[PDB]
Amino acid sequence: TPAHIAMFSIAAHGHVNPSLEVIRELVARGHRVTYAIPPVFADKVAATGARPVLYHSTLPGPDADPEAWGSTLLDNVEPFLNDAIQALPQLADAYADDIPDLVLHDITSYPARVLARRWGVPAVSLSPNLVAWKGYEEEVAEPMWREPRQTERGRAYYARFEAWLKENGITEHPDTFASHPPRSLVLIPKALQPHADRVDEDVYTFVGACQGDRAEEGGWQRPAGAEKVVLVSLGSAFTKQPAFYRECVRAFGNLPGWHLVLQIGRKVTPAELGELPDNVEVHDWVPQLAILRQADLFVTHAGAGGSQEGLATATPMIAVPQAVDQFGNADMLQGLGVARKLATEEATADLLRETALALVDDPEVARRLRRIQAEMAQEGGTRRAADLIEAELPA
C-alpha cells in the first residue's frame, strides 16, 4: 500500500528541473507521488510518473523575463506571499481526503510548508540554490532587510505575513518560516555554497552532483580534429550581445587546434556573427552535457545547471555572469581556482583567448576540477536524495 508523497512547486524551470530526477526515482521506487504544479508544467511533471495536481499560481510563468519579477527586494519577495495566500485554499481542497504521508517542496512554495503543518506530516524542502548557514540572519539578512523593514511597505508586508501564518496556527516568524526549513536537501554542490563551513548538517544535506538532465550518450560529438573544444553554452546572461558572441568568434576562430560551439539568442535571429571560420559551429539549442563531456572549456552564464555541469564535467570555465548572484558563483568558481571571472565589457576576443589558453594549460586547474568532481560524486545524486526523503517518511 503505497506511501503518498506530495511534491509542491511553481511554474519556473529553475524550481522544477533540479528535482525532476528525484521525483522520477521516487516513482521508480513504488511510492505514490503527486505533484502540485500549475497547468503549463503538467506535461513536464507527468513525464516523471507523478500525478500532476493542478493549481493556479499568480507568479510569472516560466516564460517571463526578469523585468517581470520586479526591481527591489520587496518587489521580489511579495509575489510569493500574494501567490501563497490564494494558492493555499486551492491546494488544501485538492488534497482534502487524500492527505499525504510526506510533503516535499521547492523553497518557493509557502503553501507546502503550511499544509505539512496543518496535516501534521513532515515537510522536506528541496533547495536548488544556496541555503542559510548558521549566522546568516545577523550577518546578511539585517542590512539587506534593514531598510525596507522601516518603510511603510515593508512593515505591512511583514505585518500581512504574520497575520497569514497566525491564521494557520504558525507562530514562527515569517523569516524563520520562509528561510529556515527544519529539513532540507540542497540540490547544488557544497563547492558552490557560500560560507559552507557553517551550514547546519542536521537540517541540510548537500546532494549536488550531477545525477541527470539528458544523460543522453551522444549529443554533438567532436570533429576528430579538435584538440580543444570550447562550448559557449550560456556565456552571457541572456542579454543582447552583437559584440560578445562575435568577440567569441574572434577569440577562437582559426585558433589552431581549437573548435568553438556557440549558442546564441536561442531564437536564431542573426547573420551577425558574419564570416564564420571553419572551426566555429553556432546553433540556437544545444545538449550542454554530451558536449561538456568532451569539451575542454566552457564560457557560461553560470547558473545552476551551468556552474554544476562544468564542475560535474571537470571543465574549466570562463565566468561571464551579469547578475550579482552569479558574481558570487564566479568568485566562488574563481575562488576554487577553476575559472576566471569576466563581464562583457571585459569578455573581448583577446582576453577570451589568453584566459582560455591559461585555463586549459593549467594542470592544477585540472587537478582541482578532478577534486571537486569527486566531492560531488560523493554528495550523491538522485538515489541519494531519494534515500534521504524515504528516511523521513513518517515510517
285 belongs to an annotated ligand binding site: yes
- Is 236 known to sit in a ligand binding site? yes
Residue 167 marked ligand-binding: no
Nearer Cβ to Na ion (236/315): 315
CB 315 to Na ion: min, Å: 5
Mark residues 295-314: x for contact with Na ion by CB under 5 A, - for none. Answer: -------------------x
The CB-of-229 to Na ion minimum distance in angstroms stands at: 9
Q: Cβ of residue 366: shortest distance to Na ion, in angstroms?
A: 8
Handedness of CA 126, 131, 135, 140 (dihedral sign): negative
- The response to whether 17 counts as a known ligand-binding position is yes
Spatial contact of 106 and 181, defined as CB atoms under 8 Å apart: no
* CB 226 to Na ion: min, Å: 13
Residues 47, 308, 38, CA angle at the centre, nearest 5°? Answer: 35
Asked whether residue 40 is marked as a ligand-binding residue, the answer is no
Of 101 and 296, CB closest to Na ion: 296
Burial environment of residue 297 by CB neighbours within 10 A (0 to 12, 13 to 18, 19 or more) = buried
The rounded distance, in Å, linking the Cα atoms of 302 and 326 is 6
What's the helix, strand, coil split of the chain in %, to 5?
45, 15, 45
Give residue number: closest CB to Na ion. 315
Q: Where in 345-364 is the site for Na ion (CB under 5 A)?
A: none
What Rg, from alpha-carbon coordinates, does the chain have?
22
Of positions 109, 205, 279, 315, contacts Na ion by CB under 5 A: 315
- Number of Cβ within a 10 Å radius of residue 45: 25
Q: How far is the CB of 258 from Na ion (least distance, A)?
A: 14
Q: What does the alpha-carbon distance between residue 69 and residue 67 come to, in Å, rounded to a whole number?
A: 6
Binding site, annotated residues for UDP-alpha-D-glucose: 17, 236-237, 285-286, 301, 305, 309
Applying CB under 5 A, which residues contact Na ion?
A: 314-315
Q: Which residues are annotated as a binding site?
A: 17, 236-237, 285-286, 301, 305, 309
